[PDB]
Design a protein around this ligand. Structure first.
Ligand code: MG
Ligand code: MG
Ligand code: MG
Ligand code: MG
Ligand code: MG
Ligand code: MG
Ligand code: MG
Ligand code: MG
Ligand code: MG
Ligand code: MG
Ligand code: MG
Ligand code: MG
Ligand code: MG
Ligand code: MG
Ligand code: MG
Ligand code: MG
Ligand code: MG
Ligand code: MG
Ligand code: MG
Ligand code: MG
Ligand code: MG
Ligand code: MG
Ligand code: MG
Ligand code: MG
Ligand code: MG
Ligand code: MG
Ligand code: MG
Ligand code: MG
Ligand code: MG
Ligand code: MG
Ligand code: MG
Ligand code: MG
Lengths: 343, 328, 132, 206, 177
RNA sequence: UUCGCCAGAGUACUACUCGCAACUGCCUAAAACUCAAAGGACUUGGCGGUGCUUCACAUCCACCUAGAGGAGCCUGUUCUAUAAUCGAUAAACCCCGAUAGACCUUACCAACCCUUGCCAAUUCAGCCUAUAUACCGCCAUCUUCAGCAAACCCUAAAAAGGAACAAUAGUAAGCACAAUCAUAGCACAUAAAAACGUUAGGUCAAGGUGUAGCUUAUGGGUUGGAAAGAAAUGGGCUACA
RNA sequence: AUGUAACAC
């Protein structure tokens, strides 16, 4: 019956059934778990259960300059060496059954908010350890093919940011989740924005926009109260370096639309230097905690205009009913004043 | 990979010296066919693929021709068409169009001076000229091309070659010209053999459907054929087979002027008759002049019959017929 | 589909040896025979005993060089002496190579009652013909 | 097809080659033929440059043959021509001078005239229109007309002959009946013509 | 095109007339930028997808010592440079488009690809072209052979003057120490 | 700047009111009850007894030859029938595992027997026990169809798609096709090959095996038996001259 | 003309 048996590669390939039709379409994962263990790991080649001690395999050739004889250990030494082998086997089992803890971003099972570390280095030898990348959406997307029928393609959307004001977003789609992760990480460094931050913590002015069917309204805040935003906006603002913001999103809360509209709104941001240059007038910041002191934050380079601004008695500005309702104290919603966790 | 090529060249020379040493021949006259029979003797692979046999040749012939380095140490490209993606092919089209423009300018100057000293040398048909194959042009340009680019380059070459010709431009064109071998279907006429005071006897071999026929014919006798020691009438009772024995002699109007004897083996009666017919046709070429040999060729006597019985296929009955296929 | 003695097409990363990279209809066309012996000729006897000896040699060398055996053996029969030709990786010490060589020589000589040669070539890794 | 597409059909007739110098265009045709270096097929086993063969005789013998017995079909054709010749000789010997001048004794011309009066002129095809099959008259190709004549001859003399009457004498009798235009194959051709005129109005469906 | 109204002087019987005061004001800056980028040892690429002058652009670049792509621009050439050209490839530092339109009257691909790859450009824009993506446009005529030959001659003398002056100031630096 | 409308879907252009020359009518118009969706626009396959071109080369018709289905016999199934195997069972089953059953093969049945019971050893052997919907090994089919696919790049977002040669975003290592090889000289033809995948297609009974079941029995040996045709059908052989 | 009723990423 010695000719009947086979090779361990054939045995493991028949055992785990990785090429079967169950795992092909997606029919598997109902009651399917097979583990492959290399049985040639802890072999000392000349080790045997009878315990013969060989002059070339187990023990060396020469002792005290003389030639060793073929010998056998004692039976007590045999259960000692067998005990060492089996204790190595439960040591391997103890190392194998240990699972690494997965850090949760937003929820226990979702991939939103999970970081993947620094992005991969480029072809020029450039290395980026200061950036961090975060997943905002994972979504299994299916396709209909002539042969395979359903074709599952995982697409993911990630953001990169170093915390110094440079950030970007991308999408990556592949058959395998890790391949989609790698593609999204390599594609996110190609598309980068610079986001101007007023005193490196908050944005310059209040920004309200509607990108496609997503309404994004972000508001400027002082130093002490930080990041009252939707969780994707909190992740993006943490990767940018924005520590204080208010954000309200209305309509569709689609992740890609929200990210595109957010980056468009923060890239259409107008700085005080640009405002002073386009108006040729001084801009003065009137802090409420500093009293009536006229802090000048930007000055118009070039010719300063001597003509004052036309003072309109009733300004023509577009007001939002939610903002006026919040200002007048008619917002009695129980969710607005909720105390929440840290940033 | 240039240093790899130089290493292959030098160890090929050293191995050539060891091969001449181990054969005991003259290493200065030791040549490539000597290398071929040397390797075929020392490592005799019987393999049906001729490229899978052991070889040791010039590393330039074995290794494919490689692209050189395309830029300096500063990053600046050496050639001014590197950013087109295909620098060598487009430089070739550039040189061809420059030669065509120079030909047009020189021909306009010659028209202004009222002189036509050039001649049309495009017709190299007696040499049997053909242009380069796309594979050969890829090998010359050391780069992959496409059929549309190849057709564009060949029609530009035709545009250049249909103009009045300068010597430099003809030398440019003749790099891309290839010559065919000799195209001829004329057979080799076997000379007549004279043996032991016998005049004008000829020999012929015929093969048709396992039947092999030797036919030897004398022009000095009357009309009779002796097949395998017996008379042709006794050997071939079939009137159709006797017509097959007739057919070349009635085609050449020489029915009674030849005495034949024959030796045919294998097959049946019609296969033997066809083999004898082909063997008489091939044996009669010595007596018969050249235009009537071509008349024999378009009569179809001299061409062997390739119709051989096919092999029975597995799962089938008679090499075409399959079993009865039931729809349900 | 024909599945005998073929490696399947993966994503493009599996290394393959020349013998595993050719289908069985390339035998005596592009690749050769791993065993050469007399008994498979036209009017010659004793093929089955050579066949079972061939099988037992393949399993014994596969288990005698565990993991350090690269690929399939070459088994030559020439006037009752049996030459076993191997590609072995540089895994075990040469002490252990020579121990297993002398052991296999004496054991197979006394087991098939014929003189045996063990010829080895020891390589850094598995020789890759395609893919990778 | 062991012959390639470059191979052509051989020319067998000796008088095409033996008198070439009286005309120009067929000359130019055959120097094109042997100056294109064109491959010629081998001569077929049936066709031969003999002047005593005849091609419609060869085709009729090929349709005479059942299985693979060429010599049996040629023997049946031989006794058929023998029976036609000896029947015409017996009719010649029993007549007067004007009938002896009238009677033709050559079985080759008898066979040719029998098939020329035997071939149908028009044919029928089935065409599906509106979920029904309709018979529509069509002009037939010359090879199809000759084929239908041959097939009708073999079909009649194979089917409605008696077991005791022999095949060549039966086909000789039917050859003489088709020569005198009173045969049942001639009646079948006329019946096909009846069906063709009955379906004349359907000829616009083609 | 709607972006050519500030660059148009007017219309003469339905034909657009380009203001050559503005063309000269743009062309001085464009030639000066080309001379400086040739002085600082940069890679300069001439692109013109037009099969009436293509040999003349190619010979112009051959005499300049700079590179030309007047043939079909492959899609991922400037963008996916390492797969098309080689393992390590230094991207072009400047592109001159003599014709910003291709044969099917679309704007050229390499303008958009240079805008993606942050590669500056000098483009001759006609009255139907797009000067929005071009950092240094010159409103001019790219169809008439005297205009095309004059633009090639000015870029020739600009490149030659820049490289020779780079050589002389390099020799002056060498004789300084 | 105004006016009329819109508060999930079905119930519902409905029940009950007001008004009307309308009396099987029109307008206005809910609720009880049920569900977690009802919907609008797209992307890619699939399909079409939808239309237009080019075709089919033993393939559809026109058309050629020889057969089957009718008879006898051989052989394989389906049904009944016995104490008396199993598998296949649309194309891709049906002289198929079997290039092969009087005992043996034999795994079936009836009587009897043996339980560290092939091996150097094993609180162990051994199982033709179940799952081919766990598999490997070997194949069928689309199929002599040409596509599959790693790694990149682009799209005013990206479900996905990626071509214009006087070229408008595609490069692409590789696998198939092709090329090469065999039928002892070319050529043709045949053979061989034919990727990724589809049919959870066939095979735990070539062999090994994961999982689930036995261990004085679902295991191991001896003897004797495996019928048969009420019927139907497939493939062949011999004929009907 | 039709082919009901237990598919999982
Ligand atoms: Mg949880
Ligand atoms: Mg047959
Ligand atoms: Mg223009
Ligand atoms: Mg409701
Ligand atoms: Mg209504
Ligand atoms: Mg109503
Ligand atoms: Mg009511
Ligand atoms: Mg058919
Ligand atoms: Mg029959
Ligand atoms: Mg029948
Ligand atoms: Mg029957
Ligand atoms: Mg039966
Ligand atoms: Mg059965
Ligand atoms: Mg079973
Ligand atoms: Mg069954
Ligand atoms: Mg089936
Ligand atoms: Mg028994
Ligand atoms: Mg039995
Ligand atoms: Mg059993
Ligand atoms: Mg299956
Ligand atoms: Mg089954
Ligand atoms: Mg292809
Ligand atoms: Mg795609
Ligand atoms: Mg590829
Ligand atoms: Mg060959
Ligand atoms: Mg071929
Ligand atoms: Mg085959
Ligand atoms: Mg092939
Ligand atoms: Mg199944
Ligand atoms: Mg089993
Ligand atoms: Mg069968
Ligand atoms: Mg129904």
């Amino acid at each position: 019956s010695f000719f009947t048996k086979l090779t361990a590669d054939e045995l493991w390939k028949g055992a785990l059934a990785e090429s079967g039709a169950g795992a092909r379409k997606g029919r598997g994962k109902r009651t399917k778990k097979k583990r492959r263990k290399d049985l040639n790991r802890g072999q000392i080649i000349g080790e045997g259960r009878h315990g013969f001690l060989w002059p070339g395999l187990n023990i060396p050739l020469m002792r005290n300059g003389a030639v060793q004889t073929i010998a056998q250990r004692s039976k007590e030494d045999q259960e000692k060496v067998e005990a060492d082998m089996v204790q190595q086997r439960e040591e391997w089992d103890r190392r194998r059954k240990m699972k690494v803890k997965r850090e949760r971003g937003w929820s226990g099972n979702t991939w939103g908010g999970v970081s993947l570390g620094p992005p991969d280095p480029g072809p020029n030898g450039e290395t980026y350890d200061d950036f961090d990348t975060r997943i905002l959406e994972v979504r299994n997307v299916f396709n209909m093919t002539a042969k395979e029928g359903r074709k599952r393609s995982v697409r993911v959307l990630v953001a990169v940011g170093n915390g110094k004001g440079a950030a970007g977003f991308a999408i990556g789609k592949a058959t395998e989740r890790a391949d989609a992760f790698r593609k999204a990480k390599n594609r996110a460094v190609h598309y980068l924005h610079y986001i101007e931050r007023y005193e490196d913590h908050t944005i310059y002015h209040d920004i309200s926009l509607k990108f496609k069917r997503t309404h994004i309204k972000m508001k400027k805040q002082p130093r002490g109260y930080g990041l009252h935003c939707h969780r994707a906006i909190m992740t993006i603002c943490r990767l940018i370096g924005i520590k204080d913001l208010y954000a309200k999103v209305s309509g569709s809360v689609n992740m890609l639309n929200l990210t595109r509209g957010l980056f468009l709104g923060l890239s259409r941001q107008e700085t005080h230097q640009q405002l002073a240059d386009k108006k040729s007038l001084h801009v003065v910041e009137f802090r409420e905690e500093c009293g009536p002191l006229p802090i000048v934050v930007a000055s118009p380079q070039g010719a300063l205009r001597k003509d004052p601004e036309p003072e309109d008695e009733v300004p023509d500005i577009t007001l939002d009913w939610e903002d006026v309702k919040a200002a007048q104290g008619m917002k009695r919603s129980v969710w607005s004043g909720l105390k929440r966790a840290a940033t | 990979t240039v240093d790899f090529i130089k290493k292959q060249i030098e160890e090929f020379n050293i191995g050539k010296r060891h091969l001449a040493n181990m054969m005991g021949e003259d290493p200065e006259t030791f040549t490539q066919e000597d290398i071929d029979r040397a390797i075929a003797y020392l490592f005799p692979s019987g393999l049906f693929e001729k490229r899978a046999r052991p070889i040791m040749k010039h590393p330039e012939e074995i290794f494919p021709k490689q692209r050189a380095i395309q830029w300096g140490e500063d990053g600046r490209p050496f050639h001014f068409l590197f950013y087109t993606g295909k620098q060598s092919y487009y430089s070739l089209m550039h040189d061809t169009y420059g030669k065509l423009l120079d030909v047009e300018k020189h021909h306009n100057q010659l028209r202004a001076k009222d002189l036509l000293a050039e001649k049309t040398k495009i017709l190299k048909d007696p040499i049997g000229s053909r242009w380069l194959i796309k594979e050969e042009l890829e090998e010359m340009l050391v780069e992959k091309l496409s059929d549309q680019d190849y057709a564009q380059f060949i029609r530009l070459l035709e545009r250049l070659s249909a103009l009045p010709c300068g010597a430099t431009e003809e030398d440019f064109v003749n790099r891309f010209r290839r010559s065919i071998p000799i195209q001829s279907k004329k057979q080799l006429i076997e000379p007549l053999q004279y043996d032991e005071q016998g005049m004008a006897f000829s020999r012929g071999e015929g093969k048709r459907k396992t039947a092999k026929a030797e036919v030897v014919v004398y022009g000095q006798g009357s009309g009779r054929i002796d097949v395998n020691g017996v008379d042709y009438l006794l050997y071939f009772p079939v009137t159709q087979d006797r017509e097959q024995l007739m057919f070349p002699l009635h085609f050449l109007d020489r029915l009674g002027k030849h005495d034949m004897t024959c030796a045919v083996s294998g097959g049946g009666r019609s296969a033997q008759a066809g083999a004898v017919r082909l063997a008489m046709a091939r044996a009669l070429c010595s007596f018969v002049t050249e235009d009537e040999v071509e008349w024999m060729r378009q009569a179809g006597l001299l061409t062997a019959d390739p119709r051989v019985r096919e092999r029975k296929k597995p799962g089938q009955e008679g090499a075409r017929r399959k079993f009865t296929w039931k729809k349900r | 589909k024909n599945r005998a003695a073929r490696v399947r097409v993966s994503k493009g990363d599996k290394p393959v040896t020349y013998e595993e990279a050719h289908a069985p209809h390339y035998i005596a066309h592009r690749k050769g025979w791993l065993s050469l012996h007399t008994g498979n000729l036209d009017g010659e006897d004793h093929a089955a005993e050579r066949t079972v000896e061939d099988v037992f040699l393949r399993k014994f060398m596969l288990g005698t060089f565990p993991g350090c055996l690269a690929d399939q053996l070459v088994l030559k029969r020439r006037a009752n002496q049996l030459e076993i030709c191997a590609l072995v990786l540089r895994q075990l010490p040469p002490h252990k190579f020579y121990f297993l060589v002398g052991y296999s020589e004496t054991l197979l000589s006394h087991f098939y009652k014929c003189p045996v040669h063990l010829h080895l070539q020891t390589v850094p890794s598995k020789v890759v013909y395609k893919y990778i | 097809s062991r012959y390639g597409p470059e191979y052509k059909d051989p020319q067998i007739d000796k008088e095409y080659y033996r008198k070439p110098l009286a005309e120009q265009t067929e000359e130019e045709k055959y120097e094109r033929d042997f100056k294109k270096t064109q491959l010629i097929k081998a001569a077929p086993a049936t066709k031969t440059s003999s002047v005593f063969e005849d091609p419609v005789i060869s085709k009729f013998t090929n349709m005479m043959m059942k299985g693979g017995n060429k010599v049996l079909a040629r023997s049946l054709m031989t006794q058929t021509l023998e029976a036609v010749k000896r029947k015409q000789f017996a009719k010649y010997h029993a007549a007067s001078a004007e009938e002896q001048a009238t009677i033709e004794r050559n079985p080759y011309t008898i066979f040719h005239q029998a098939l020329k009066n035997c071939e149908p002129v028009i044919g029928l095809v089935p065409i599906l229109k509106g979920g029904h099959f309709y018979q529509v008259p069509v002009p037939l190709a010359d090879r199809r007309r000759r084929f239908l004549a041959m097939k009708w001859m073999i079909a009649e003399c194979r089917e409605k002959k008696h077991r005791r009457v022999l095949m060549p004498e039966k086909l000789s009798q039917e050859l003489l009946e088709a020569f005198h235009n009173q045969g049942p194959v001639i009646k079948r051709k006329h019946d096909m013509h009846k069906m063709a005129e009955a379906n004349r109005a359907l000829a616009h469906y083609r | 095109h709607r972006f050519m109204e500030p660059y148009l002087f007017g219309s003469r019987l339905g034909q657009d007339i380009i203001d050559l005061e503005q063309t000269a004001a743009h062309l001085q800056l464009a030639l000066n930028f080309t001379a400086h980028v040739a002085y600082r040892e940069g890679i300069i690429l001439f692109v013109s997808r037009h099969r009436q002058f293509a040999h003349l652009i190619e010979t112009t670049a051959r005499d300049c010592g700079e590179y030309a792509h007047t043939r079909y621009f492959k899609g991922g050439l400037l963008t996916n440079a390492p797969l098309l050209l080689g393992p390590g490839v230094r991207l072009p530092d400047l592109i001159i488009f003599l014709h910003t339109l291709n044969n099917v009257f679309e704007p050229h691909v390499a303008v958009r690809d240079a805008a993606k790859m942050n590669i500056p450009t000098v483009g001759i824009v006609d009255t139907n072209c797009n000067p929005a993506l071009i950092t240094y446009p010159v409103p001019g005529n790219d169809d008439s052979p005297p205009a095309v030959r004059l633009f090639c001659r000015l870029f020739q003398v600009a490149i030659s003057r820049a490289k020779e002056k780079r050589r002389q100031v390099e020799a002056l630096y060498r004789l300084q120490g």
